[PDB]
Amino acid sequence: TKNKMEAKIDELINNDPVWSSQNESLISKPYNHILLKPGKNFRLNLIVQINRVMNLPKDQLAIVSQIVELLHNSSLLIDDIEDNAPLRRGQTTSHLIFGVPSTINTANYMYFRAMQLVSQLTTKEPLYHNLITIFNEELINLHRGQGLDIYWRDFLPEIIPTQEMYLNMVMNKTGGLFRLTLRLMEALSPSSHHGHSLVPFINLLGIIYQIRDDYLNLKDFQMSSEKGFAEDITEGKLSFPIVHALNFTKTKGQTEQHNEILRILLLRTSDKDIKLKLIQILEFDTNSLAYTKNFINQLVNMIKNDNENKYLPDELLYIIDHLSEL
């Protein structure tokens, strides 16, 4: 009917868009799948410990936590598509089960659900503005560092990053979410003057976290063809040890080794022997693994020897030792 048609259309356009709980569940599949991954208690533990200094009431702390989890999980769903990763914590990656399209859309949807939860942290307009700014700033930083990490890898050998370039990329990429969490808590703290800001400390933790992630991905494989897959090699990633090896070989004039490192990265290979060959070049030829192990210990020592509490404000050590499960 021309009349019934028009009446139904009129009703449609005069109401909010219709969305059912059934709809909500269908599009949530990729997210529900990655929730089966653990490590959630470790992240919560770091938030709970920082809260000994910030004192956010429990209800508010739970919301900060929900925001953090959504952003962290969304980042991993996108990152696995970006890295072409087959597994995440021993399980099949969501994009391989539900497809790349649904996974990208669900991860992006969850970023906006996280943004929505921010307005539940306060009713004070000045504070709210500040919270959304922190959220906006650090997601911008995360995307900038992720953008460089990806560009270096996909356009190699166009740019061979230096250690400093790598470190600035990580301050953006990994620091983004650490700082996002910490800044929200500091903005919300009802506590008078809980001492100097912990941003430097959280930046340091983000850097130790990333470099250790890079280091263990190779070391675990070197120690066992089944402890890890050294998937970072398959991905062609300009990891901390690889950056050291590429610059070391350049510097010492090891032309053949420089080029062979690049060649293997460019193969995107899953061959275990070829991955082990590159790892042993880093072990014996460039000593990049030892150099990295020592760099990490030095970073950790800047905290463990922080007597004048210039970074620190106990549980510290445990968190640092389990930094890999964040």
Contact residues for Mg ion, defined by CB under 5 A: 79, 83
Residues 145-174 binding its own copies (CB under 8 A) are: 145-148, 150-151, 154, 167-168, 171-172
**Which option in Mg ion, its own copies, none does residue 229 bind, with CB closer than 5 to 8 A by kind?**
none
81 in contact with its own copies (CB under 8 A)? yes
What is the nearest approach in angstroms of its own copies to the Cβ of residue 167? Answer: 6
- What is the C-alpha to C-alpha distance for residues 22 and 225, in angstroms, rounded to an integer? 43
Name the residue type at position 32: N
**Which option in its own copies, Mg ion, none does residue 6 bind, with CB closer than 5 to 8 A by kind?**
its own copies
**Which option in its own copies, Mg ion, none does residue 126 bind, with CB closer than 5 to 8 A by kind?**
its own copies
Q: What is the residue whose two structure tokens read 């690889």?
A: 242
Residues 193-252 binding its own copies (CB under 8 A) are: 199-201, 203-204, 207
| Adjacent-strand bridge partners of 87 | 92
301 is in an annotated binding site: no
Question: Which residues are CB-neighbours of 314 under 8 A, at least 6 positions away?
Answer: none
Applying CB under 8 A, among 40, 144, 194, 250 the residue interacting with its own copies is 144
Query: The tokens of 1 are what?
Result: 């009917």
Radius of gyration of the chain from its Cα atoms, rounded to whole angstroms: 23
CA of residue 14 relative to chain centroid, distance: 42
At residue 88, the 3 state secondary structure works out as: strand
What is the nearest approach in angstroms of its own copies to the Cβ of residue 17? Answer: 4
* Element housing 92 (H / E): strand 91-92
DSSP 311: S
Residues 8-47 binding its own copies (CB under 8 A) are: 9-10, 12-14, 17-19, 23-24, 26-27
What is the nearest approach in angstroms of its own copies to the Cβ of residue 84? Answer: 8
